[PDB]
Amino acid sequence: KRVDFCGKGYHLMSFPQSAPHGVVFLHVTYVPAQEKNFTTAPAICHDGK
């Protein structure tokens, strides 16, 4: 859950690969797309509640 620790976006999973004197991580993340506009409210009022 650490932001940016395992790639950009919401981390899903990672896979390691070996390199000559190092390691390559393949990070799979979720990136939200195609946002729409809406009107919001904090609470609803119904029956005086």
């Binding site: 650490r2 932001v3 940016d4």
Partner: protein, 50 residues
Amino acid sequence: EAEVQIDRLITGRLQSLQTYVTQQLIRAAEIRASANLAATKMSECVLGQS
């Protein structure tokens, strides 16, 4: 006779310059870790909730 006296200065000044350059490497390795912590705090406290 001035070669022998110039070499005594050359040796000293080289020693002093190289001491300066070692202590800067050791001080930069410490500034680097602080900046690496600042970069993690910017990710985890400013662009998120930790």
